[PDB]
Amino acid sequence: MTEYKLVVVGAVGVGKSALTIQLIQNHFVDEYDPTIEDSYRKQVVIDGETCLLDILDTAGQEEYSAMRDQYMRTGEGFLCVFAINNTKSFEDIHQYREQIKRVKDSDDVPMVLVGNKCDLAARTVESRQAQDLARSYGIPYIETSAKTRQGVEDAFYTLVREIRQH
C-alpha cells in the first residue's frame, strides 16, 4: 500500500507529541515529557485510499537541533507547528521552513502550517497573521487542539493531500 512519511516539527512545548498521540491513539497527553525523537505508524483510509502513515515526532529543544538535517532528509511532508499562545514559537517557524527548504533544495516541499492549542484563550497569534505566513510559503494554515481534537485529523490528512499534489 501507499506509505506517506510525515514529520512533525516546531518549537518546544507547542504540542507536536500531543497532536501525534491524539491522531494515532485517540487521547490527550496532559503532561509534558520532552521528546528526543519518536516514530508512529498506522494504517488509515484517506479519500478512499488505504495507506500507511509513518510519522516522525521530533524534538523542539534547540539543544537537539543537530538532528534536524537527518529527519528533514527522509520526510515526504512536514507539519510545521506553533502554538497560538506562543508568539516566539510562531516566529521560530521560519527557521524550520528555511532548513527544510535548504535540505530539500526546494521551495515546494509539502508542508502544512499548524496553529495548535486553539482551545486556549490567551491568543497572541491571530489567525490572519498565520494565514499570511502560510500564503507566503504556498501552504495551508490549519488550527488545531490536541486537547479537544479540533482540527487534528484535518491537519494530518491535509498534509497527505499536499504530498499528493507534489
Q: How far is CA 59 from the centre of its chain?
A: 12
Listed in sequence order, the residues at least 6 apart from 76 whose beta carbon sits closer than 8 Å to its beta carbon are 4, 5, 6, 110, 163, 166
* C-alpha to C-alpha distance for 105 and 22, rounded to whole angstroms: 32
- Residue 136, annotated ligand binder? no
* Rounded least distance, CB 103 to Ca ion, Å: 4
Residue 31 in marked binding region: yes
Q: With respect to Mg ion, which residue has the nearer C-beta, 16 or 97?
A: 16
Report the residue number, 145 or 158, with the smaller CB distance to ligand GNP: 145
Cα–Cα dist 88/83, whole Å:
9
Which residues of the shown chain bind ligand GNP in the complex (CB under 6 A)? 12-18, 29-32, 34-35, 59-61, 116-117, 119-120, 145-147
C-alpha cell at 113: 502550517
Complex with ligand GNP: residue 32 or 49, whichever CB lies closer: 32
Residue nearest to ligand GNP (CB): 60
Q: Which residues make up the interface to Ca ion (CB under 5 A)?
A: 28, 30, 103, 107, 137-138
Classify the C-alpha dihedral 23-26-32-34 as positive or negative.
negative
Residues interacting with Mg ion, by CB under 5 A?
A: 16-17, 35
